[PDB]
Amino acid sequence: APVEISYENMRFLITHNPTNATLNKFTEELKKYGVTTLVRVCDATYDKAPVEKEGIHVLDWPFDDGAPPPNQIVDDWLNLLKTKFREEPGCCVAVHCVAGLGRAPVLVALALIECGMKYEDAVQFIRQKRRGAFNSKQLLYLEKYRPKM
Amino acid sequence: RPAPVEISYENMRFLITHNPTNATLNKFTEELKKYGVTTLVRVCDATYDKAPVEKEGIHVLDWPFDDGAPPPNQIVDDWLNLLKTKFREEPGCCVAVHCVAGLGRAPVLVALALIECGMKYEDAVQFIRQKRRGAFNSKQLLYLEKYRPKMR
Amino acid sequence: SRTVEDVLTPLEDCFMLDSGTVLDFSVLASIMQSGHTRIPVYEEERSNIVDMLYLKDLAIVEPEDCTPLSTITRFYNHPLHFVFNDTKLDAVLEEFKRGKSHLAIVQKVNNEGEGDPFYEVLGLVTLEDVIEEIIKS
Amino acid sequence: RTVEDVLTPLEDCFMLDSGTVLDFSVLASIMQSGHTRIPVYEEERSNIVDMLYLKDLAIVEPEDCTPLSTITRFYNHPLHFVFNDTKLDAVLEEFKRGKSHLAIVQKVNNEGEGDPFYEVLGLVTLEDVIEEIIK
């Protein structure tokens, strides 16, 4: 069962991946939250067209198990949010990795910090929402993360 | 309530019971035998064959009075005489009573004995309800307060 | 402070079955559709509760042929457990721990009547409810 | 006391596979257990997708043989997740906030250079929690 994370003008679903069996109820669940864009980081298994037809732009942006995001994925992630909250005020960004508690929330926590949340607070906020979040490796990257932007 | 209640006080000893069926007659008799009763007094539910009880040594007395009714003086006199002898003649032993669920006229009769054995009326009433919650309605409390002992 | 009376389920609202129930499909279905662990058995007045049906009782039936209730209750001969309406929650809690069972049936005494007193049966209370009333709020 | 002491570990749980057929001898095997609540796994036992209640089975007959996997899609019972370290009173809240009087028991996992996960440990019901409260 999926997780909302609101902070200010920003809005995030952390999800699980569907099967093709669940795909309709998955897409309907996305539509319920009013999403414009999925990012798949993991479980890149199912037909994306039925989701993209319903309005929901799907990006396979895969990186590694237990890893911080590659810098290029960061910049695409940052740019995606920056427009999509400005272009459609209100709307949500969906992510899933494999149980939604490693690299998927890293991308979220990334965003929060870039929105000028303190590192620790960003982290705690996520962990409040989903307990277990981040390995030590990713926590570090978060800590070491200086925002610009 | 099918679990019976002993009430001890000095050389007096009283089982209050439920009546059996015949389906339960043996286990009932064995239960009476356990407590070492020499005499049943049936006040109600005189429903079952008594000989299988008396064959096992236990004298069965049908001394019925009605629901709500107090003990008739002759029953009072007979009860009191029963205990006075039965506790002297066999020291140790118990008398069984039953009426219906054993919180009305059966524990009245027990209380009556206690008072005659020199228990304060109030004290008897509590001592019973101690062993049998809900014993005595109003009318019987009125009876018990109004009962004057002398005897044995 | 709080007695059993407060945690009680009143009698009309208890799921009960009569002692000459027959256990066909649709009764067994109703039993499962209740989803009580512990269904009490009356005869033929409701306030008169004779025996206790556990769930694992019905497990060793099939609805062949229709198999009657009053048999099954004779089988295990499950003991049934009485508590007074005015017993306090912590005290009734003690009785349950002395019990195997986690369900009591609830009497008060009846002093109205020129008759002998009797135990009026008021209904049911489960261990569950008693705890569920010491979360309290 | 945490869930963990009161937890039934997974091997010792009665459960059923997701492509169970409910025939006679299966429906009996459900009944002869006498849980109110039976979990539904796929196909690794630690992976639990759905949740057979009892009153589910009431409204089947073993005609024809009827799939389990249908029944569970029918009512679509939510399944309730608990952490291992949840203290017993805190668990008891979650049963009271839920309809449900069973939760499946998740331990976290930061062991491994991977992403975290929830390990699945086993099961804890209302009855067990109270059965501990008395002890």
Author numbering:
A (entry chain B): 5 to 153
B (entry chain A): 3 to 154
C (entry chain C): 317 to 453
D (entry chain D): 318 to 452
Quote the study that presented this structure, word for word:
Recent reports have shown PRL phosphatases bind tightly to the CNNM family of membrane proteins to regulate magnesium efflux. We report four new crystal structures of PRL proteins bound to the CNNM3 CBS-pair domain that reveal the effects of cysteine disulphide formation and nucleotide binding on complex formation.
We also crystallized PRL2 with CNNM3 under a variety of conditions in order to assess variability in the complexes. PRL phosphatases are highly prone to oxidation through formation of an intramolecular disulfide bond, Cys101-Cys46 in PRL2, or Cys104-Cys49 in PRL34. We compared the structure of PRL2 with a disulfide to our previously reported structure with reduced PRL25. Oxidation did not induce any large scale conformational changes: the reduced and oxidized phosphatases overlay within 0.6 Å. The largest changes were adjacent to the cysteine residues that form the disulfide bond. Disulfide bond formation moves the cysteine away from the CNNM loop and flips alanine 103 so that its methyl group points toward the CNNM3 aspartic acid residue. This shifts the CNNM3 loop by 1 Å, which may contribute to the lower affinity of CNNM3 for oxidized PRL2. Crystal structures of PRL3 (C104A), and the oxidized forms of PRL2 and PRL1 all show a deep pocket which is closed off in the complex with reduced PRL2.
